[model samples]
Target: SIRLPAHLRLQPIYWSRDDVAQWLKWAENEFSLRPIDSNTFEMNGKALLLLTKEDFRYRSPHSGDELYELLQHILKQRPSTSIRLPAHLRLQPIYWSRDDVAQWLKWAENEFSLRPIDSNTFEMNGKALLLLTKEDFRYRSPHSGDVLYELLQHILKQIRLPAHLRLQPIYWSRDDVAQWLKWAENEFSLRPIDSNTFEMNGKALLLLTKEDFRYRSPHSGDVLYELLQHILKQRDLEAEAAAAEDLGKKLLEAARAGQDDEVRILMANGADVNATDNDGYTPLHLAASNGHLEIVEVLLKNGADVNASDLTGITPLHAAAATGHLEIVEVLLKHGADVNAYDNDGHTPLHLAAKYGHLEIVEVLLKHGADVNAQDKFGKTAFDISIDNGNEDLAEILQKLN
Candidate 1:
């Protein structure tokens, strides 16, 4: 028989050893991050799918918020699973050789009735093939262009940890395999799948077919097979959601620390900009509170709420004003901060400014028309606070309004 085409991975569970190696190689050249050694990550894609954060730590000996970014990107971009192919024909194209990619397109012609792919022009590997524009693909194969891009996207969809049974089946503990058989038997009400007969691990289980199951258990073996296939997909999606949640928590911390670099990095990596902590304080609230102008600027520029409020209804403007940051006060107001907005304590920006005797901020607030007579829950006015603080200049500014 002629050499069959390389597998096209529309899902990650089907990734080969070659695919894993290529992923590591590219991550090295592209990001210059040190690649995990082959021994530590020698498993094929199915086993790779089983890797946990602990696995990532000891295996890669390093890095989440980062790995989660990669996984979440998969969840975000997952699609093209609709591209039809035999169950066995799967691959993560990013790891494919140039020859392998062209073979995939050649296979496409037979499966999809499209024009033949020109091998010479499509000489690049799957990595650069991904780099090709849609228009470029159209020029090469007009009828197949858009769908070809879909196949490539299908390849990316594989980035999620697809915990299909093919994964860990080869390495699962014998005790676990016994439970799986017992579970499958109960699920389908098949004859008690004798744990004694299925004495080996899931590796042996993977080798069995429907006919094999029927020979062993008789009536409902086919149903057990179907159940495994169905449940594996459920497991894969569950893995994806867990990783996305992991990255989201990391974003809140990055935002709180006022490390502009990490916040910007995390945001660009797809962390939500306005995500709040339990107190409902957004990244903008933390940045303004600490007077980190650069962090505030980054957040606002990227869609942070300028007037984002915490559970107490205290906004960034409240933090800036009370903290005596004239620049933050001006920036907040310039961004449409509520001039007379009060917190739960009933203190407006002007109250905080005048209470702290910030002369410059008091004038800025007056120009913005903040209520000088606004009383906090304590029932004090900006003029009264200024006089109490004995800041004659601030008192004079507040007095002018009377």
Candidate 2:
């Protein structure tokens, strides 16, 4: 090989990786190189090594003096490549301690397509090892019904007794698990998570409706209103207003507590009439739901997006109807509320009215084109709801719509 001609030095190169086609395709498309047709080819010039094997062995032809000159050529011709130097071919040593082990396992699972061997073992390269980490079962698996309840019961029992008297490593009794399952089935009617990213259980709904967890700053009484005005005055108001909205959510409780004058003042000074609280409810939604007809009028006039929903996907119209606020419903309808609009429960205004025996409201919604035959999340129509609640008149009215 040393006595060979200068032009035909490196030959019969063997590839050790499985992804030669992918690498060649990328090289051709990205660096505008011709397709590498033959794996072993003779070249008149020095052969260039494009990629290294997974084991980090590189195929380089140039020796010490020539390699140093090539490095200088790379620095002058392609400075960016020089910056990316100790390159993809170089492998660094990875050290893992006990704490680092779990993190490394997680990273390897995500990045290198690794997986757990079993409940107790983690497998790597066909070798199985025991899980050294302690189990902290805070989150409940959707399939394991009553497991969380059993854990909670055990925790409660352990807490009631002294530490020395408590059972060590308490395992849940089968009877206790069964009892919890029955209780949960009767009380909460828990449903498994759907593919559509919603939970059909009341407990899950409660959790979803809880406000976001974040540290709140001490608020001045009028800061939100002033901030709104200041944001609207900016040259690029969209970015400024979006930033202000985040801070304004902290003042929602005060704004919703009969502060009509303050709310109106803010609106007049260019506050978003449709500005949402932490739960995605606008001021109009709150006021209307709580039967503030005057505030509803002000919000409607100031241009709020009327059909906006809260975290639970309940619109202002849905809230007003559910609470049987006839005046608020009337105001909302006058300001172009969708009478047939459904909430997360798929209940329209007519469904709510029929369920609560709000006969007058039902008549109003029917007059305004509310869909009486519309079904709820449970597949019960307005008539079905009325019949279930023994509202004969409401049932008869809805039956006519059928």
Candidate 3:
């Protein structure tokens, strides 16, 4: 027997250096406890072992007063025992203060073939790993156990544990931890922490979920499900807006190019007939200006405003008459275009036709009730403009109409 001090003889024998060394030798054969230094060991060059506060408490059954006094007399300087593991194998410890010991037991059972023996120990290959009580391992219910077991398996796969000795158990309700973990993984691909929270870069766990986005987020089972629904709706809205923009562009191009068939196809596919170009010219204005009578008719039939104007307040009738398209003028008038409608310059279709010397357009407009006496911004009527531009034929028509 190892000799003790006279004052400590009556107390239970705590471990000595030699006793710990012998125990470590036995652990090396059974548990792969590889010695690193005099006071340190590792398992598979991964998990570390050092004399921590728990180790002293587990070895000593008597009061700590004698041990504290003896350690004070014998000790020199304390050294750091902190260990670092490989990046891929560094897993967070099971937080005993925040989760139940069963979480670690299930993990150990899968990784190390752990089996419950009695109330205080779990056997691995019929050898006890540690003394855990029945209260620590017993399940509250079968349903909870199944859920917790699945959650543990998921966590084990996500986190990489080192070989063995550094493993510690946790102690909170299974449901709370599992719910937070599932949500963290689903939203941000993060791991849960000890406080029912998660960590990724440098933000809090609550800041990561879609709860902040929800004015009234759906009552889905998980945050991920609700976020997915929002994503789906946003994607659909974006797609519809893109298609509408593309069709609007195509419609303007077809109307400008006088492709009446393409105009009809685009309109039938839900293109906005009144959708304006950069110059605020709708398809109707474009078609009429270019003398595409068929395209103009198509636009009118598709609910286009016959009198829709450009940014200059120039209506399709003004565009047709100013460009000397007599047939397009007729088409506009037939579609209920306002014949005397004024532009930004206060010039009507008849005033544009008279000023531009479109004699046939002036005649067509007069036949359709154009105001030959209507004045423009310069207070010039069709007759005044026609005579000023030296258009004898258009001036004669406007003079006869007046």
Candidate 4:
């Protein structure tokens, strides 16, 4: 029968121990589960928010996932509950204790279904374990070690620091928090707060509500709060944008060359599927214009627009018809492409098909309801173009309506 206030429900990060316990009470009734012992979870919102599914499973067993789902449901972060690489998992491995390192290493093997490394042989503290290169890792369990090594490398990249001292947010010390305040003061020219005012560690700092900053002028405190949100997000966004910017050109080039495999690999690595070149040409336009049927399929499946036009209003269907690719024309039309689309020359797919002496493409376009009487900018219809090209077969078929 308990109901938390809107602020506490929406802002789960600010929930006190009793608040979380109350939530458990509400969840119990909502889920029709047994009353959970509040005394068992005597931690504040920060630690409670950080609680892992493994932690829940150990304590709540049958109700583990349900409890976790309820927590995130109130948090409202993920749309599909996509796997969140936890702070505990991404902690600077250099700081892991020997026993903790081994425990996590074992967790990895089962988590990803990796082959078990000999626990005794692979045993080492975090500082020592961080030294293993990918090749060095293969010396232990071959396949699984490579993945673990790459995973370790990935985590290192996720937490950047000067000269390899990087740690995730929750792992930052109070000293680390002060260091950032100094950096922000210098870089952004913002008013600095008292050292005592910001004595909390990174976890506490992140969990800080706007009210937490009220020790200073409330308006000034709000600036610092907003700055904190941007500072945390800036690097992540920078890295993401940099990938698309650089790989965007390469993906367009690969698509133009019809290298389907490299196109696939580049796409996997972060190339934008619909990215354009200087000529306003998308990968789909290049792939279709070049008569690469497989590339067209791959691009379409990866979300390329079948009806996307280049700078000149030339769609993929126009490219296919102009290049005499009957199969590609069929595929584009199958994907709901505009069969009567026009290029800058006011040339319909039918105009190009007849101009290129592509009888089969013309037939396919016509069957798909391409207007045989549609005229280009030069006042020439498909039948007129066929007569101009002296393609007797194309003219004869196009003349059925005339």
* Candidate that scores best on TM-score: 4
Residues 1-402, model 1: lDDT tens digits? 111123523455555666656656544554566655644445455444444454354335453234434533443543523456543346666666656766887766654444455765464555446555554554455445555665566557652222333344456678877776665554333445577766777666777775665466543344455555555566566656665556556767766677778887777766667777788887788788888888888888888888777899888999899898889888889899998888898988888888888888888889989898788887888788888888898888678777
| Candidate 3 residue-wise lDDT, 41-133, digit = tens | 111111112222332333332422333333333332222122222333244433331122434544433432223323122211110111111
Instruction: Output the TM-score of candidate 1.
Output: 0.47
Between the candidate structures 1 and 4, which one is better when assessed by TM-score? 4
What would the TM-scores of all predictions be?
0.47, 0.39, 0.45, 0.49
Q: How much lDDT does each candidate structure score?
A: 0.65, 0.47, 0.53, 0.71
156: Cα error in model 4, Å = 35
Worst 10 residues of 2 by lDDT: 125-134
User: Candidate 1 vs candidate 2: which has greater lDDT?
Assistant: 1
- In candidate 4, list every pair of residues with a backbone clash: none
Q: By lDDT, who's the top model here?
A: 4
Among all windows of 10 consecutive residues in model 3, the one with the lowest summed lDDT is: 123-132
Q: After aligning candidate 4 to the native by TM-score, how far in Å is the CA of 88 from where it should be? A: 41
Q: Write model 2 residue lDDT over 1-402, tens digit each, in one string.
A: 023222222231222122323333333454464444423121111112221121011112322233334323433542200112122212221222223323333432332222231221221111001111011111111111122223222323431222331222123243332333333222222222122232123233223221110011111111212222232344255455765565345325434775778777666555666677667888877887778777778778877778887887788888888778988888888878888887788988788788788888888899999886689999999889988899888788788866
